Design a protein around this motif. Structure first.
Motif, mmCIF file in Angstrom:
data_model
loop_
_atom_site.group_PDB
_atom_site.id
_atom_site.type_symbol
_atom_site.label_atom_id
_atom_site.label_comp_id
_atom_site.label_asym_id
_atom_site.label_seq_id
_atom_site.Cartn_x
_atom_site.Cartn_y
_atom_site.Cartn_z
ATOM 1 N N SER A 164 0.801 -1.223 0.000
ATOM 2 C CA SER A 164 0.000 0.000 0.000
ATOM 3 C C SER A 164 0.843 1.287 0.000
ATOM 4 O O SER A 164 0.847 2.002 -1.007
ATOM 5 N N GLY A 165 1.554 1.551 1.107
ATOM 6 C CA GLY A 165 2.376 2.746 1.283
ATOM 7 C C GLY A 165 3.867 2.519 1.445
ATOM 8 O O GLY A 165 4.345 2.155 2.525
ATOM 9 N N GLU A 166 4.616 2.806 0.377
ATOM 10 C CA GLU A 166 6.070 2.669 0.316
ATOM 11 C C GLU A 166 6.762 3.966 0.763
ATOM 12 O O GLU A 166 6.311 5.065 0.423
ATOM 13 N N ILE A 167 7.871 3.827 1.516
ATOM 14 C CA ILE A 167 8.724 4.928 1.996
ATOM 15 C C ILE A 167 10.223 4.502 2.028
ATOM 16 O O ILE A 167 11.117 5.355 2.098
ATOM 17 N N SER A 168 10.461 3.164 1.914
ATOM 18 C CA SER A 168 11.738 2.443 1.918
ATOM 19 C C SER A 168 12.469 2.481 3.258
ATOM 20 O O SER A 168 12.799 3.557 3.762
ATOM 21 N N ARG A 169 12.680 1.285 3.847
ATOM 22 C CA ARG A 169 13.327 1.072 5.148
ATOM 23 C C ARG A 169 13.610 -0.420 5.376
ATOM 24 O O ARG A 169 12.824 -1.277 4.954
ATOM 25 N N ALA A 170 14.727 -0.722 6.067
ATOM 26 C CA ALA A 170 15.131 -2.096 6.357
ATOM 27 C C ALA A 170 14.243 -2.694 7.432
ATOM 28 O O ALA A 170 14.369 -2.328 8.603
ATOM 29 N N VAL A 171 13.307 -3.576 7.032
ATOM 30 C CA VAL A 171 12.369 -4.198 7.975
ATOM 31 C C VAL A 171 12.240 -5.702 7.804
ATOM 32 O O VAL A 171 12.280 -6.202 6.678
ATOM 33 N N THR A 172 12.069 -6.416 8.930
ATOM 34 C CA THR A 172 11.857 -7.863 8.969
ATOM 35 C C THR A 172 10.429 -8.129 9.466
ATOM 36 O O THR A 172 10.122 -7.836 10.625
ATOM 37 N N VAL A 173 9.558 -8.660 8.566
ATOM 38 C CA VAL A 173 8.131 -8.939 8.821
ATOM 39 C C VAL A 173 7.811 -10.427 9.005
ATOM 40 O O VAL A 173 8.296 -11.260 8.237
ATOM 41 N N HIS A 174 6.961 -10.749 10.003
ATOM 42 C CA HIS A 174 6.576 -12.125 10.326
ATOM 43 C C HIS A 174 5.076 -12.450 10.080
ATOM 44 O O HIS A 174 4.396 -13.035 10.930
ATOM 45 N N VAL A 175 4.586 -12.096 8.892
ATOM 46 C CA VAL A 175 3.218 -12.353 8.451
ATOM 47 C C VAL A 175 3.032 -13.832 8.073
ATOM 48 O O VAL A 175 3.990 -14.483 7.667
ATOM 49 N N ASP A 176 1.800 -14.353 8.188
ATOM 50 C CA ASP A 176 1.473 -15.747 7.854
ATOM 51 C C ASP A 176 1.536 -16.026 6.344
ATOM 52 O O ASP A 176 1.685 -17.177 5.931
ATOM 53 N N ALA A 177 1.410 -14.964 5.536
ATOM 54 C CA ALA A 177 1.507 -14.953 4.076
ATOM 55 C C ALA A 177 1.593 -13.495 3.627
ATOM 56 O O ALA A 177 1.198 -12.604 4.387
ATOM 57 N N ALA A 178 2.141 -13.241 2.416
ATOM 58 C CA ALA A 178 2.287 -11.884 1.883
ATOM 59 C C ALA A 178 2.169 -11.846 0.375
ATOM 60 O O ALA A 178 2.460 -12.842 -0.291
ATOM 61 N N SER A 179 1.735 -10.698 -0.168
ATOM 62 C CA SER A 179 1.565 -10.535 -1.610
ATOM 63 C C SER A 179 2.906 -10.351 -2.299
ATOM 64 O O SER A 179 3.807 -9.732 -1.726
#
Length: 40
Positions: free
Chosen positions: A7-22
């Motif tokens: 949805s909203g991009e700004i760019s940053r180093a992130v580690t996400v723990h979602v059950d699934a992703a697009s």
RNA sequence: GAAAGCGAGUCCGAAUAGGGCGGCAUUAGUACGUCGGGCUAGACUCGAAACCAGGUGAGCUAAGCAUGACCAGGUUGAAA
């Protein structure tokens, strides 16, 4: 279960723990440096 | 989107016309109160004829059974 969507991009180093992703959300988290964690 | 699912995209379809959606220039919801209106209850009040359940009645009347009572007086004159 959780889901990450592009949805909203700004760019940053992130580690996400979602059950699934697009496709695009992965190609935005990694594209700005980072990981999208999913189980077995 | 029927759904698997996919996701600012998604569904028809073998790709390109379109549906609904986001961006839209975009404003936001939620808890409670009073009020409008809805729905569900007898649902603004009063009124049926009728339908069903259980029971009360044969001390009236319709009959049956048992056991008692009753029919002045006169006329006619059957069989044998």
């Amino acid at each position: 279960p959780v889901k990450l969507l592009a949805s909203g991009e700004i760019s940053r180093a992130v580690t996400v723990h979602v059950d699934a992703a697009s496709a695009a959300a992965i190609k935005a988290v990694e594209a700005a440096g980072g990981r999208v964690v999913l189980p077995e």
